[PDB]
From Swiss-Prot, chains A, B:
Domain of life assignment: Archaea
Record-linked Pfam families: CofC
Pathway: Cofactor biosynthesis; coenzyme F420 biosynthesis
Annotated catalysed reactions: (2S)-2-phospholactate + GTP + H(+) = (2S)-lactyl-2-diphospho-5'-guanosine + diphosphate
Keywords in alphabetical order: GTP-binding, Nucleotide-binding, Nucleotidyltransferase, Transferase
Oligomeric form and interacting partners: Homodimer.
UniProt name for this protein: 2-phospho-L-lactate guanylyltransferase
PANTHER family for this protein: 2-PHOSPHO-L-LACTATE GUANYLYLTRANSFERASE (PTHR40392:SF1)
Role this protein plays: Guanylyltransferase that catalyzes the activation of (2S)-2-phospholactate (2-PL) as (2S)-lactyl-2-diphospho-5'-guanosine, via the condensation of 2-PL with GTP. It is involved in the biosynthesis of coenzyme F420, a hydride carrier cofactor.
Entry's Gene Ontology molecular function annotations: GTP binding; phospholactate guanylyltransferase activity
Length: 210, 210
């Protein structure tokens, strides 16, 4: 495996859409827990070259599991620079996917197309396997899943949609913490489970502080 | 090799959490389009007959694609009666799965386990394949996904979790119509596309009326 993974990450001020339920301190710990999980899953699928791409060393000073990479530019700028310098296929993976497994990561990066794309909630992109980093450009934010699919083509690459519920579950708002509680394992899940419980009220399942 | 498939369906007042982005009249029309697409996927997967289990004929007055079975009892009571009278495997599929493909239904009903289960959001159950109906009891609503796995294990039977983003997108609230616009094809999607567009605002996708 000549293939690298890079994880965009910023610990400071993380997950402000969780601020109705989680403190600032809670939110940054939670995001640290998720990062450590995605890194540990990437290793477990036998990917040993793991990069973190961050605009500061904050919460990354003692990190040894993956190379910390500093880059203060915005996401798309930073990732396109990285893709430029890449010389072996690249898996761009978000840090907020605590339901993502070694198995998912294997099947994604075993695509037979040039690009494998995992969608997130709301038209985002949770995971991007790119075989030709010199041929590809990315554009996160907004309607990125579809914009990555037409960047793939517009650039003479073919692409796979990886159809996964678990991989598709990015944690961004309080309601996504119900998914985590129902479906996850690990310190990220345990952390959330130490502060909330699930309760049925509307014939429906809701999060409630413990 | 044989098997029955049932779709719990009630056109009237169908999808109240879609109000107020949709009307009564719109809700009932939408739901009917979604039903039709599910029955077409079941047929596309070669399943010989499909039952629709509905508390009235309303919206089913003309209906030749599937046998209409009437049962005025509560969902679980009706489904649990249907299960008792089946001998062969039963796929229970919700009528609100417009991203569900014949390929998903082929794979679900080919499970090598005793039950296959497809999660929907907030711990719901979007599709349930039960090989031994005599040994299974359903309980939709609330936390039904976790309940059906534990109904399975309490009963000796092993279960597969079918991990699919598309079969796991049930369309129940406004934010779900975003997913339909991004990922879907077909009449239910065209219906919505005729009334809304996607718009990007906080670096995020939102549904806005035309």
């Amino acid at each position: 495996n000549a293939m690298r993974a890079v994880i965009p990450y910023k610990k400071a001020g993380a997950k402000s859409r969780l601020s109705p339920v989680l403190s600032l301190q809670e939110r940054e710990e939670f995001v640290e827990l998720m990062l450590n999980q995605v890194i540990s899953s990437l290793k477990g699928a036998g990917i040993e070259q793991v990069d973190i791409l961050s605009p500061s060393v904050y919460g990354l000073e003692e990190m040894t599991e993956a190379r910390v990479l500093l880059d203060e530019k915005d996401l798309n700028e930073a990732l396109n620079r990285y893709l430029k310098e890449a010389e072996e296929p690249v898996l761009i993976v978000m840090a907020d996917l605590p339901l993502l497994s070694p198995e998912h990561i294997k099947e994604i990066s075993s695509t037979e197309k040039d690009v494998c794309i995992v969608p997130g909630k709301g038209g985002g992109t949770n995971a991007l396997f790119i075989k030709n980093p010199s041929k590809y450009r990315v554009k996160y934010y907004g309607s990125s899943f579809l914009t990555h699919c037409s960047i793939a083509t517009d650039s003479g690459q073919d692409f796979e949609i990886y159809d996964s519920f678990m991989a598709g579950t990015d944690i961004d708002e309080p309601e996504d913490l119900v998914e985590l509680l129902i479906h996850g394992k690990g310190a990220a899940k345990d952390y959330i489970e130490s502060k909330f419980r699930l309760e049925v009220k509307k014939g429906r399942v809701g999060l409630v502080p413990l």
